[PDB]
Design a protein around this nucleic acid. Structure first.
Ligand SMILES: [Mg+2]
Ligand SMILES: [Mg+2]
Lengths: 469, 419, 469, 419
DNA sequence: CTAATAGATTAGAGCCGTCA
RNA sequence: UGACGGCUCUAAUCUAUUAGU
DNA sequence: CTAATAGATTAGAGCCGTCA
RNA sequence: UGACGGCUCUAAUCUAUUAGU
């Protein structure tokens, strides 16, 4: 038993120097910060893919209706919001012969067919980019649904190139990092789902009242990948640099080799936000140890601090190294070795697998979003999914799980640290949602890690987020 | 006179009208609309007519399927025609065609040859055309500033959406452990104890340590399973109390405080398992933790104060289940969770993980916060013995009282919950 | 008395299907073929260079006038001509401080200082391409005059260092092939020609009467390098494929040897004109030997034929091989062994050594532009440079010097060969001029060769032209 | 009436008016201006008034400095105003401001309450506004086809711009060789000539070949330098007629056709060099070839046949020089090159590449086709021997007669040369 | 192999003019 | 992979004590 | 260095609901 | 390198013949 508290809602700075809380309303009211003049696209896939992509592009011309405006806001049109053009006339087509796809389903090995299909697509993409005089921005892929149907690992019949994953999407994105060509992979079922039904008279996937949110998500992603900045934070102070470390298991080698991939964010002195990945994979041959060796710790911290100095000029006064795990004395001392004097070093640990669900005594609706339970000077509980008065709906259908935020090494106030976490959940550019369940400094690090682990032939990988999401 | 009136189909076309009005205001143009204000009951058409006739420079009407053949639209068109006749102004009414399917065979007779602004291609093009037409008509304006639009958004959109201080009361699943024994005991049995007896099967909880036995129980107890206990001296037991080793006031080279706390946790968990075995309740084997559920018909009509614990779904049965844990952070708690399981007829399980998972997924859709809370509390009160508590035997005569009321939390900020 | 024939001036196909003889009038009356939505322009250089570039880019928006309007068609404005947006609001900047540039030009060795300057300029471009989010169509390098005048092959004072050409431009264009970055190099003298002066109070370069032409050339370069197609040929024979050859002498790449490069044109399916090279130098160690050993010749012809088949599916009926050298029996026996039976190989050699200057009796203007003195069945002349009735001026001063066309190998009509050579003079995208004095298939090959020779061994080079020119 | 009238400042704005007219015609709107109806036989004034009064739908005017206070512009404006009053058309005159220097203080008093469309920055916005005005005002349109624009470009743009067939005679720098000696002679000197005699420096052309000697002269010719020559039978030599060599007929194992033709070309070049050295003409040595030039004072008044060969440029005196090259493709010729060389005072050259190049490139600006032609022909005439022949010395009697009138070509395509 | 005599070819560099 | 949320089945690792050294 | 008995941390995969 | 054109100073390779090796 202890009293709760409230941690408000963040503000995000749209065009004209205006403010709001929901990205949808702000974008549909004031407009984006960047003026992209147009978008050029190229579709790879059988003629069915070209037809479906063209129909979807022409579909946004017709009005899109959502069931409820307050619960799920509608889509007021591409050009009416984003101040650009994305039409079905700049489409550049590279047909994939169905015979090539069919003839490749004979090796009966998932790795070989996955590699062969990834090659069959990326070869055409690379050759089109290299040997064609048209200028493109985003490349779209429309995979046949039977390919994904036959890629299930649990399927039975009724070493130079062996270090590759068994997934189409991860490997496909992996082998285009040395060409810097932004790509969006589409499953043919998602675009054309009405024609996909089951033995019940109804579509397999229902988007009837949630077509508007799908249009929002796809439009926002395709705008971000082409060099746009739809919204930006405004309550960020100076001197603060955030890092999020996420550990993985590369496997596909002599040792488990738990790699580490990070992200970085701070202020750029031009009233802008620098949300970029920080990934040169650091590897630990030890199994199960989720702590970095002192050399790796110094390398990671020094690279991040050098990037901060190059962007601004002087080192930060406060760095928050977020992680999903705890830390040990040797790693923190290794951080302290390279860290300057007037540079406070604070460690934060965030967890969700803590059984504590609050049931409302009076009503049946869920708990308020921004509530908190301050356990102690060095720990507190933050709710990020639930009921928001602006949308008048519940983020999670059931009783949501809170977040167990604790500070491990260093000293920092336990409400400012919790307010920054809630303030960092408004910059998820992959999806158009009011809020997420994790700070993005620990969310996009996972995607960065999972992309550049399928292949290990990459030196100095890109840092922009348009080649990863 | 520095004003524009928009007539629409309330509430069918609120979104488009609101977006257009906010866009026009953002550039510094005054826009007057019916949905902007909420003054009802007082003379409303008279004020509307006076504003239209006196200080209205431009009038626009939007047309939709709903707005077609409507009394309000016809009356507004008549008023606009009267105003135009009085002012002898040709350009005073401009339709805003937004219905693509509204064919010219069924459009209003009052608007059949009027120049209608096209919004079918792109709404931004229509907005630009509106701005160009207003500039051509010399609509009065001030310096470009969205301050008026920002003020309107602050004072209208978020009027009843500010911070409201209201006390709230919360339930949870932390059940605080109340009663604690006097001391902890290691019963030294140097080459005098069974080695592979599986000491986790006795009638009293036990956690081993080297060749000792760490439990709150007395040496004379559980002698049934250990015949060679009587020939033993009481001076060979390291008694350690409980309150200080909970508070961390124990620093001895014999056992580390963390290890003793771990043994405490294990004793509490084993006592819970044994006692729930004593209740004669069924057991489910999940991946790591074991849940608890009743048979069909254990209680009267499968109810406990109007709370259902065993039911039937389509041609299948379901039993509510819970799980517990004994953690000591931040304060001694017995955290409780919730799960659901399924039985084909009412007494036998289905040996299929996929079927159980899908069945749980289907059922939990219709259960809300109140449902889970009621079921959890009611199943907990099934345990509580006499008036407010329940015991976990951890010795010869030592009972550990676990409460039956969830830990409460207090909050100071809430919402008005407008249905 | 001998006889001269006349070959008419070919037209070129602009937008809307209209055919106009001059590129300038075609663009100022109909417009470019495709539609770019804008030019996302980036600038790399110093602050003064950026200021002058901004002033110049603001200068050409308004209609700018020549001196003699009859001779030179006017430049009315970028948006009124090229149908795309280009201003100084979307300019993206990346500073190179004066201190670094000054300190790099201090080693007193041209090779090392050029290497350092190129690396300085290109690392920023690579980093901004991989790490940053902004989309840049063309990078506009603004090199100051104080370092331009020293980046020359011959410098006199008043270890993989000998394998690279001592030129800033070629090194810049050949060090960016693996990243595929379009790039435009500018000088501080060209932009602010008025500000730059000499001992006397006059500008070094008098542009006071060549302003419109300068704007036309700069604008068409900026339009084409961003992904545009300003014009195309009006009529191209179907089933006939061309070629072009230029030999370039290496700068002591461990031995004095020579390479061969190509660039072809033909009408593909869809009534389009493909204009794309055949990259990959083919050397021979013998010094001064401008021929192909049989293996290289077979490889070249096989690659060209396979590319044509892949694009179309039918083998070419005629293959023209333009060159400035002569084919010996060895390399023509290398050909025709991979050539299909239903295919015709023609060898045309073009040179301008033979001095036949023709004068006009009692006149002040030179000869016309479409003449030809057909000497035999396998020889001719062609006056690609001369007086033009449309613009009432001569393309050259003094008396122009004619061409020579000889069919060393093969059989075809000489008149058709002259007409085909004359049509390949209208496709110079580097400048908006009425007509070229040299077929472009033997000039873009040279442009590719001078760049590929200025770097080390590089695999799978791009085939598009915007990465070289 | 489907006809639209456009007025401007004829003819100070031909380009802009032409572009606007073509762009409007291609979009289906006709334009009446001086570009159309290129004929003056019919009355050029009454047609305008008749068209305005009878069959003109929409009238337009373009504001410009030249059009202001113009009698014709004022009369057209008055006629348009009368037509507008008759038709009661509120919007019948639409001035367009295209001049940046037209300040708002010096605007016409007639138009002061009407908005003006700007054209200073970009014409695209003005064209779009004009199109919107035409489409809104229901301005009539013709058949939509690019054939109108194509035909107008074909028949109006190049009216007085087409080439006219006419005979013209083209002069070259190809002096045709008229005669050759009948036979070529390889003379067998069985080691009678010294092994290091350097036969290239004797009085007559000579090229070594095998153990024989190749020359056009007599068998016992140039014996001054070879005293031991008389003791040689004349039958020990090979006489190949020169008519069969320049016919592709002679090909023997002793010497082939190509080598003999090369030998003849080399001998002709040597003979030309000797002859030009025997005409008392100084020479300048280039990188690969040699040019022969005149000195100052050798030629009367530095002017031969009303044409000048040596002139003066400030502090430098220039001289006109030529070089010779003999070829047999397609027929025996002699290519003559045009060069300019400079002197400080008319007898001494300037020995520096930079200054020679600078002076040479500075001169060519003034000179043109006629200057080069006349100077070269005068040079050849000065080199002439009797009237039309200019032989080269090859021996006692053998001579190669080269014409002093270069080969002339005729062409059926020429331009009118409009001064 | 080395060193000269020529005719017939090739590729590099560097400088100047663009109007009146 | 258009998102997000909530669950379920698995595998290491560490710590402590014990028996195979 | 191996095998069990616990508590306490960690990362993989797979499946289902979004409305009424 | 914003284009293009016209000149000039230089360097190879090949073919033929001769000659010292
Ligand atoms: Mg994505
Ligand atoms: Mg260029």
């Amino acid at each position: 038993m202890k009293e709760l508290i409230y941690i408000e809602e963040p503000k995000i700075l749209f065009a004209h120097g205006q403010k709001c809380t929901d990205a949808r309303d702000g974008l549909a009211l004031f407009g984006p910060l960047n003026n992209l003049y147009g978008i050029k696209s190229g579709v790879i896939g059988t003629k069915q893919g070209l037809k479906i992509f063209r129909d979807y592009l022409d579909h946004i011309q017709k009005p899109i209706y959502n069931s409820n405006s307050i619960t799920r806001p509608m889509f007021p049109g591409f050009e009416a919001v984003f101040d650009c053009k994305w039409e079905s006339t700049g489409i550049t087509f590279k047909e994939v012969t169905n015979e090539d796809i069919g003839k490749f389903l004979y090796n009966s090995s998932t790795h070989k067919r996955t590699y062969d299909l990834v090659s069959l697509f990326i070869d055409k993409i690379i050759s089109a980019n290299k040997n064609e005089d048209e200028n493109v921005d985003v490349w779209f892929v429309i995979v046949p649904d039977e390919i994904y149907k036959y890629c299930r690992p649990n399927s039975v019949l009724p070493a130079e190139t062996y270090n590759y994953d068994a997934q189409f999407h991860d490997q496909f994105k992996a082998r285009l990092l040395k060409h810097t060509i932004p790509t969006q992979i589409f499953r043919e079922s998602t675009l054309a789902w009405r024609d996909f039904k089951n033995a019940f008279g109804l579509p397999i996937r229902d988007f009837s009242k949630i077509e508007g949110h799908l249009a929002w998500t796809i439009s926002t992603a395709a705008f971000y990948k082409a060099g746009g900045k739809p919204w930006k934070l405004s309550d960020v102070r100076n001197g603060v640099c955030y890092l999020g470390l996420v550990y993985k298991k590369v496997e596909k080698s002599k040792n488990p080799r738990n790699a580490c991939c990070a992200a970085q964010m701070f202020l750029d002195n031009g009233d802008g936000t620098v949300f970029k990945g920080e990934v040169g994979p650091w590897y630990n041959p030890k199994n199960g140890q989720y702590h970095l060796e002192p050399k790796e710790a110094k390398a990671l911290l020094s690279q991040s601090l050098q990037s901060y100095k190059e962007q601004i000029g002087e080192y930060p006064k406060e760095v928050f190294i977020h992680a999903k795990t705890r830390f040990n004395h040797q790693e923190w001392d290794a951080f302290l070795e390279v860290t300057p004097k007037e540079t406070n070093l604070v460690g934060v640990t965030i967890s969700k697998t803590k059984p504590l669900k609050l049931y409302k005594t009076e009503g049946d609706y869920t708990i308020l979003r921004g509530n908190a339970y301050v356990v102690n000077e060095r720990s507190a509980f933050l709710w990020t999914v639930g009921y928001v008065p602006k949308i008048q709906t519940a983020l999670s259908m059931e009783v949501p799980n809170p977040l167990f935020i604790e500070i491990n090494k260093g000293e920092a106030d336990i409400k400012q640290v919790l307010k920054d976490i809630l303030s960092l959940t408004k910059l998820n550019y992959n999806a158009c949602i009011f809020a997420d369940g994790e700070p993005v400094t620990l969310r996009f690090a996972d995607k960065i890690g999972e992309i550049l682990t399928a292949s290990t032939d990459i030196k100095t990988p890109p840092l922009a987020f348009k080649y990863y999401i | 006179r520095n004003k524009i009136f928009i007539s629409h189909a309330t509430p069918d076309d609120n979104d488009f009208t609101r977006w257009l009005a906010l866009k026009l205001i953002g550039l510094g143009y005054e826009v007057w609309c019916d949905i902007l204000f909420l003054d009802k009951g007082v003379d409303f058409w008279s004020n509307i007519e006076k504003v239209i006739r006196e200080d209205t420079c431009k009038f626009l009407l939007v047309s939709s399927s709903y707005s077609n053949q409507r009394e309000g639209v016809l009356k507004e068109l008549a008023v606009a025609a009267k105003v135009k006749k009085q002012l002898k102004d040709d350009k005073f009414i401009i339709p805003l065609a937004i219905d693509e399917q509204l064919s010219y065979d069924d459009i209003n007779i009052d608007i059949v040859r009027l120049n209608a602004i096209d919004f079918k291609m792109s709404w931004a093009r229509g907005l630009k055309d509106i701005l160009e037409a207003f500039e051509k008509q010399k609509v009065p304006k001030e310096v470009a500033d969205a301050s008026k639009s920002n003020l309107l958004y602050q004072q209208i959109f978020l009027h009843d959406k500010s911070v409201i201080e209201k006390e709230e009361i919360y339930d949870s699943n932390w059940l605080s452990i109340l009663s604690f024994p006097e001391e902890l005991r290691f019963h030294e049995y140097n080459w005098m104890l069974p080695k592979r007896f599986d000491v986790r099967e006795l009638t009293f909880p036990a956690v081993r340590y080297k060749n000792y036995l760490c439990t709150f129980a007395w040496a004379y107890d559980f002698t049934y399973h250990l015949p060679k206990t009587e020939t033993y001296h009481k001076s060979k037991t390291i008694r350690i109390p409980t309150e200080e080793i909970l508070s961390g006031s124990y620093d001895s080279n014999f056992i580390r405080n963390a290890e003793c706390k771990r043994l405490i946790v294990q004793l509490l968990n084993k006592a819970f398992e044994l006692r729930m075995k004593d209740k004669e309740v069924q057991e489910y084997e999940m991946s790591n933790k074991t849940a608890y559920w009743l048979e069909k018909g254990k209680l009267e009509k499968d109810k406990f104060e109007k709370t259902m614990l065993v039911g039937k779904q389509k041609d299948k049965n379901w039993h509510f289940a819970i799980s517990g844990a004994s953690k000591l952070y931040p304060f001694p708690v017995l955290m409780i969770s919730s799960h659901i399981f399924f039985t084909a007829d009412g007494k036998k399980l289905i040996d299929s993980s996929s079927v159980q998972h899908s069945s749980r997924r289907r059922q939990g859709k219709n259960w809300w916060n109140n449902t889970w809370r009621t079921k959890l509390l009611a199943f907990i009160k099934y345990l509580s013995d006499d008036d407010t508590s329940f015991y976990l035997e951890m010795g010869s005569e030592e009972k550990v009282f676990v409460s039956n009321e969830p830990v409460k939390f207090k909050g100071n900020v809430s919402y008005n919950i407008p249905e």
